């Protein structure tokens, strides 16, 4: 199973996909400041993804 979150017009959208199709009843929307997924880095550089 896969989960996708992407930004569109000052908000966040999501859905869930299994096999090759989309599971009905998993759509939703989050504000721009309350996303419940939190990537964490320790040492931050300029212009790179992830951290050292």
């Amino acid at each position: 199973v896969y989960t996708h979150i992407y930004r569109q017009d000052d908000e966040y959208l999501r859905y869930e996909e299994v096999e090759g199709i989309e599971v009905a009843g998993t759509e939703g929307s989050y504000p721009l400041t309350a996303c419940p997924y939190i990537p964490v880095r320790m040492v931050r550089l300029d212009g790179e993804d992830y951290g050292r």
Binding site: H4, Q8, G20
Partner: protein, 51 residues
């Protein structure tokens, strides 16, 4: 109808971006071999691996 960032699916975005993590995993595997070898296992390990 899934206009931007989502015009190709979920298993397609995951495969293009999978090649950006390559240096970090190698460097972490190098780090976690003089302190605790079982802290960061590889993705191809099973019951028979010996540390």
């Amino acid at each position: 109808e899934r206009e931007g960032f989502a015009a190709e699916g979920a298993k397609a975005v995951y495969d293009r971006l999978k090649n950006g993590r390559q240096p970090y995993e190698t460097r972490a595997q190098n780090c976690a071999a003089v302190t605790i070898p079982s802290l960061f296992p590889k993705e191809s390990d099973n019951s028979s691996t010996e540390y």
